[PDB]
Design an enzyme around this catalytic site. Structure first.
Site, PDB file in Angstrom:
ATOM      1  N   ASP A 130       0.988  -1.275   0.182  1.00 46.98           N
ATOM      2  CA  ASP A 130      -0.009  -0.066   0.007  1.00 46.98           C
ATOM      3  C   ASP A 130       1.088   1.219  -0.166  1.00 46.98           C
ATOM      4  O   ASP A 130       2.096   1.347   0.447  1.00 46.98           O
ATOM      5  CB  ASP A 130      -0.924  -0.108   1.224  1.00 46.98           C
ATOM      6  CG  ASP A 130      -2.011  -1.099   1.257  1.00 46.98           C
ATOM      7  OD1 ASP A 130      -2.586  -1.415   0.150  1.00 46.98           O
ATOM      8  OD2 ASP A 130      -2.135  -1.837   2.357  1.00 46.98           O
ATOM      9  N   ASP A 137      -3.994  -3.783   6.461  1.00 42.40           N
ATOM     10  CA  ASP A 137      -3.992  -3.644   7.998  1.00 42.40           C
ATOM     11  C   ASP A 137      -5.569  -3.563   8.607  1.00 42.40           C
ATOM     12  O   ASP A 137      -5.778  -2.814   9.476  1.00 42.40           O
ATOM     13  CB  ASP A 137      -3.302  -2.254   8.110  1.00 42.40           C
ATOM     14  CG  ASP A 137      -4.038  -1.138   7.512  1.00 42.40           C
ATOM     15  OD1 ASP A 137      -4.583  -1.210   6.315  1.00 42.40           O
ATOM     16  OD2 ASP A 137      -4.178   0.008   8.208  1.00 42.40           O
ATOM     17  N   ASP A 151      -8.750  -6.597   4.851  1.00 44.94           N
ATOM     18  CA  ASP A 151      -7.590  -7.097   4.079  1.00 44.94           C
ATOM     19  C   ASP A 151      -7.425  -8.541   4.776  1.00 44.94           C
ATOM     20  O   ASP A 151      -6.400  -9.267   4.147  1.00 44.94           O
ATOM     21  CB  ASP A 151      -6.163  -6.063   4.332  1.00 44.94           C
ATOM     22  CG  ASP A 151      -6.517  -4.776   3.663  1.00 44.94           C
ATOM     23  OD1 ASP A 151      -7.301  -4.605   2.718  1.00 44.94           O
ATOM     24  OD2 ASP A 151      -6.182  -3.634   4.442  1.00 44.94           O
TER      25      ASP A 151
END
Ligand code: CZA
Ligand code: K
Ligand code: MG
EC number: 7.2.2.10
Length: 994
Positions: free
Chosen positions: A351, A703, A707
């Site tokens: 990310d 996180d 996910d």
């Protein structure tokens, strides 16, 4: 009700047939509970039960030693020796080590947590329901709650089920959807329906999710779904219906276990066939029972020989010594096998915000309108210095510092940034620097207002605390902040209603200050503010604005541009419906454009090199960001994912773009994609699936609970140190410093570990292959035994175990990050590697037998015997004239067994030096580099002498200490193993490498 958000409050009550006032009658409760089931998640069945160790004894390579122990136990009792304690040793030590490695192998209690069990922490204990059988609010068990229940929630309560909000009793309702988003800002809820039947959870503003907790307020609603039909529940099933394959190395070990078992069974038949000559012997010339002992003892000899009894203990120690190194580089690794497959990482999906970027939002550039004259349209661009939340900076026009207050446009610019802001600044004295309060984006705006100071307020005479929200508060003195129209993705903008403070500051009634994404806001601007005056938004003007905004986002600056407009003539306070979050965009029309701020999300200091590192390592890096495709690509070029001037029109996809592609084109895209912007919540797991379809080991990051399935599905799930608890329990690795560099740094460590790991594995195998040849030669030829199975245990477990563990500290081969990832289905030993350790195993099998043969024939203290009569030692009592010299006990002497044992050990010490490198010679690689190896070798010979001196030891090992006369011959037969292997290395580097 799966689509409760899309339905109105009236329709949701009519569906379940329930009055909002009364609730569910106990008749309805029985019916619903029996139909939908209890509001709970399924339990897990496989805890620390007696099942634990048993499954270790299910594969063939361990049941052989369990069988060989049975055979050894038969032979431990059937003997004419009056020996006491040294009787039950061969079956005892085998069984003890068998249990020992089993306990080591069943280590999934401390080194393996649970992710679904952690998901049971969200479902609360009790919840408040309004049943029809009672008037007052009655709290029941959360699991007793059924779909259709009229539940109540307040501040602090943990939402029990997925609930369609009916009525909000408090002023505003805020819930903490931190687990289902990863964010922290409590989102605002409403009661009006979300028309989109396939809207995501972030857009479902009329829904409370099971697991969420109300941050502020109190509301009443009707239960939509319970149990697994909830959003948390649905994510659970995704992780539940996902089997996790064991690491490729473990499969190779299991495959090696099957092949080895075939070899062991082959020799036992081979030995049986060599002994077919005893079929032509007189029945009145001996006993069949004496033969059965020979067949049984050779059987357990091959078992302990071919099998590395120390290997599971060595790798478990090696991997544990790796985890401590992972932790030193800010990489908390959960499971132990993960540190091995980590080196075989081929793709890292990371990310942007938090990992690739330092998350230091700072307004760098901003512009306003200067002059508009039909076609002519000039702007006033300003730059801002200081990449921090500290107000220690200055505004400059054309690289020259200016007073922002002298420009009328900039004043209203700073006005909007201050009022249309839910964040603030706070100075920290403990740390010594300023800190953010709220969102990073809005706090950067707060910092900007302080740097600008459009009203010229005293700043040097103020303290460090007063400095924080100094200028911002001054803006709040002018305008009274009435209410704030919350942000939403449907319009991508935020406004705030402001009334002028009682001081007559020349304000045309009330004002609405709008802040949002450039696209939406600009299009809703009919007017353009030029200083103080107002001109109509013409074509040429909008062209200039969007162009500069495009230049700041696509350019090398890679800025996140935010358009700031204001509504000069807003609708009356009474005409606005505040509960209608759909009319917010309507209320934000007829706007007047003021200016655009451009802030930066700066990359890490180390990611530039780390990205370049993965380029050389053959590791594909894929960025997943929330920026627009344009800026997403620009940031890729900035950090090194893309070239400064290379074509990437097919290597970057938006969530919308990737979803419009058919399944085939999606898979086809995931092998060449390096940038994903505006990704849908389900896409992260889709990408992993597609990546795994190319047998590509994927390191996905995340996180949140969103996910969680993706982290569970990917080979190397990566969570953040600040990430939610569930994300960590679903990941294989947790970054301590939330850096992308520590992903790359961990992979390099994991690759070096796997190289040193494969090295000592071949080292132990080399010894085991030799103990096969040794026993095979001493059994087929009919020679007296050279090595005892009780000895072979302590050889492979200790004499070979210690230097093999020291091989884990072998120096990392440089230029290892210049090689492509280790292939998943890559054979441990094959081709030349087989023949190499086949020759070593064959030689040491002749060296040990030859050592015992030396003492039996051409020796000093040994008797003058020949080879043809040594093979007939079983006829010493029978054929007396042919065999004469001394007692028949001399054939079972401890000296020749000490020869074969000392030689085997001495060679293995040299073989450990040969395992300092796979191909690099001992002339190239100094045998004194690995200090831990030399320290281990010296410990091996120290224990080798300890079991030959301290009397309670050599009697048990059936050995007898040698002098300098006999030790010379040991080195003369052992040391040539170095030269032979050195030849093989030179062959491999000359007539194989190319
Ligand atoms: C009883 C038990 O827990 C075990 C052990 O005790 N061992 C290992 C092991 O897992 C066995 C094993 C399975 N697959 C392989 C590959 C290479 C080496 C080994 C194994 C060692 C085997 C044995 C019996 C020593
Ligand atoms: K996983
Ligand atoms: Mg095991």
């Amino acid at each position: 009700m799966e689509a409760a958000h899309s339905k109105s409050t009236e329709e949701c009550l009519a569906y379940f047939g329930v009055s909002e006032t009364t609730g569910l009658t106990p008749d309805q409760v029985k019916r619903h509970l029996e139909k939908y089931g209890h509001n709970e998640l399924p339990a897990e069945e496989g805890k620390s039960l007696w099942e634990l160790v048993i499954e270790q004894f299910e594969d063939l390579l361990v049941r052989i030693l369990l069988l060989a122990a049975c055979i050894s136990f038969v032979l431990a009792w059937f003997e004419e020796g009056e020996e006491t304690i040294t009787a039950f040793v061969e079956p005892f030590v085998i069984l003890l080590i068998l249990i020992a490695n089993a306990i080591v192998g069943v280590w999934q209690e401390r080194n393996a947590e649970n992710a679904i069990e952690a998901l049971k922490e969200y479902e609360p204990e009790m919840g408040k329901v309004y049943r029809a059988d009672r008037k007052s609010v009655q709290r029941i068990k959360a699991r007793d709650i059924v779909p259709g229940d009229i539940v109540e929630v307040a501040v602090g309560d943990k939402v029990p089920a997925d609930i369609r909000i009916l009525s909000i009793k408090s002023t505003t309702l805020r819930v903490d959807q931190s687990i289902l988003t990863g964010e922290s800002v409590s989102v605002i809820k409403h009661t009006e329906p979300v028309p989109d039947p396939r809207a995501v959870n972030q857009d479902k503003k009329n829904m409370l999710f099971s697991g969420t907790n109300i941050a502020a307020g109190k509301a009443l609603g009707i239960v939509a779904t319970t149990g697994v039909s909830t959003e948390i529940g649905k994510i659970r099933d995704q992780m539940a219906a996902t089997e996790q394959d064991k690491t490729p190395l473990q499969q190779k070990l299991d495959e090696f276990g099957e092949q080895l078992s075939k070899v062991i069974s082959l020799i036992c038949v081979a030995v049986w066939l060599i002994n077919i000559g005893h079929f032509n012997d007189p029945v009145h010339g001996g006993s069949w029972i004496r033969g059965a002992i020979y067949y049984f003892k050779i059987a357990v000899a091959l078992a302990v020989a071919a099998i590395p009894e120390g290997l599971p203990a060595v790798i478990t120690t090696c991997l544990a010594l790796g985890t401590r190194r992972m932790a030193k580089k800010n990489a908390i690794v959960r499971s132990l096998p993960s540190v091995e497959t980590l080196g075989c990482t081929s793709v890292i999906c990371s990310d942007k915000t938090g990992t690739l970027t330092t998350n230091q939002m700072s307004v760098c550039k901003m512009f306003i309108i200067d002059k508009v004259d039909g076609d002519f349209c000039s702007l006033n661009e300003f730059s801002i210095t200081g990449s921090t939340y500290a107000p220690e900076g200055e505004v400059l026009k054309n690289d020259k510092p200016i007073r922002s207050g002298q420009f009328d446009g900039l004043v209203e610019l700073a006005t909007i940034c201050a009022l249309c802001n839910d964040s603030s600044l706070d100075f920290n004295e403990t740390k010594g620097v300023y800190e953010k309060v709220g969102e990073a984006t809005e706090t950067a705006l707060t910092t900007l207002v302080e740097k600008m100071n459009v009203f010229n307020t005293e700043v040097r005479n103020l303290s460090k605390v007063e400095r924080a929200n100094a200028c911002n508060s001054v803006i709040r003195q002018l305008m009274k902040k009435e209410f704030t129209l919350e942000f939403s993705r449907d319009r991508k903008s935020m406004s705030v209603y402001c009334s002028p403070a009682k001081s007559s500051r020349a304000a045309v009634g009330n004002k609405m200050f709008v802040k949002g994404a450039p696209e939406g806001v600009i299009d809703r601007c009919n007017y353009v503010r030029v200083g103080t005056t107002r001109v109509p938004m013409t074509g040429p003007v909008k062209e200039k604005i969007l162009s500069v905004i495009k230049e700041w986002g696509t350019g090398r600056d890679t800025l996140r541009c935010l358009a700031l407009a204001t509504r000069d003539t807003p609708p009356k306070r009474e005409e606005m419906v505040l509960d209608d979050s759909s009319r917010f965009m309507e209320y934000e029309t007829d706007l007047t454009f003021v200016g655009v701020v451009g802030m930066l999300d700066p990359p890490r200091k180390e990611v530039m090199g780390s990205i370049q590192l993965c380029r050389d390592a053959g590791i594909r890096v894929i960025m997943i960001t929330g920026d627009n495709k344009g800026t997403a690509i620009a940031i890729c070029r900035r950090i090194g994912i893309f070239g400064e001037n290379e074509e990437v029109a097919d290597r970057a996809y938006t969530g919308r773009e990737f979803d419009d592609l058919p399944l085939a084109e999606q898979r086809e895209a995931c092998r060449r994609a390096c940038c994903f912007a505006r990704v849908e919540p389900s896409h992260k797991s889709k990408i992993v699936e597609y990546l795994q379809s190319y047998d590509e080991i994927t390191a996905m990051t995340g996180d949140g609970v969103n996910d969680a399935p993706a982290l569970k599905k990917a080979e190397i799930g990566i969570a953040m140190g600040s990430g939610t608890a569930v994300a960590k329990t679903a990941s294989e690795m947790v970054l301590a410093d939330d850096n992308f560099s520590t992903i790359v740094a961990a992979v390099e460590e994991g690759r070096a570990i796997y190289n040193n790991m494969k090295q000592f594995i071949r080292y132990l195998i080399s010894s085991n292959v030799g103990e096969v040849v040794c026993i095979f030669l001493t059994a087929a030829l009919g020679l007296p035994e050279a090595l005892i199975p009780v000895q072979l245990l302590w050889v492979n477990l200790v004499t070979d175990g210690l230097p093999a563990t020291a091989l884990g500290f072998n120096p990392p081969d440089l230029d290892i990050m210049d090689r492509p990832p280790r292939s998943p289905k890559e054979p441990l030993i094959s081709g030349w590697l087989f023949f190499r350790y086949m020759a070593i195993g064959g030689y040491v099998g002749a060296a040990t037998v030859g050592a015992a043969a030396w003492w039996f024939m051409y020796a000093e203290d040994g008797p003058g015997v020949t080879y043809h009569q040594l093979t007939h030692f079983m006829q010493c009592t029978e054929d007396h004239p042919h065999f004469e010299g001394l007692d028949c006990e001399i054939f079972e002497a401890p000296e020749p067994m000490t020869m074969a044992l000392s030689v085997l050990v001495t060679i293995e010490m040299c073989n450990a030096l040969n395992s300092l490198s796979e191909n690099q010679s001992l002339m190239r690689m100094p045998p004194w580099v690995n200090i831990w190896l030399l320290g281990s070798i010296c410990l091996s010979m120290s224990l080798h002498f300890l079991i030959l001196y301290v009397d309670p030891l050599p009697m048990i090992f059936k050995l007898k200490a040698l002098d300098l006369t006999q030790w010379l011959m040991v080195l003369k037969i052992s040391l040539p193993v170095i030269g032979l292997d050195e030849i093989l290395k030179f062959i491999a580097r000359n007539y194989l490498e190319g």
